[PDB]
Design a protein around this nucleic acid. Structure first.
Length: 64
DNA sequence: CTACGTAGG
DNA sequence: CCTACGTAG
């Protein structure tokens, strides 16, 4: 149910509902996410990015 | 080793 | 300022 990525040498999983912001960098989907009020950072490839997330990205792009 | 987007302490 | 991320150049 969550986004799986690697950040600074480790695998992580975050529930989409935790995403704050998302944007595109080449083929990479980059983002920030809530970690208790603290702001995490994560990135994953679009091939490994899950629909919902891709959906958030689209809207964000559409908007702006 | 550079580029690309964006924010973090 | 500048790294971190995935992928290409």
């Amino acid at each position: 149910v969550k986004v799986k990525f690697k950040y600074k040498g480790e695998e992580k999983e975050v529930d989409t509902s935790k995403i704050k912001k998302v944007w595109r960098v080449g083929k990479m989907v980059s983002f920030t996410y809530d970690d208790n009020g603290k702001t995490g950072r994560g990135a994953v490839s679009e091939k490994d990015a899950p629909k919902e997330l891709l959906d958030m990205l689209a809207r964000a792009e559409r908007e702006k």
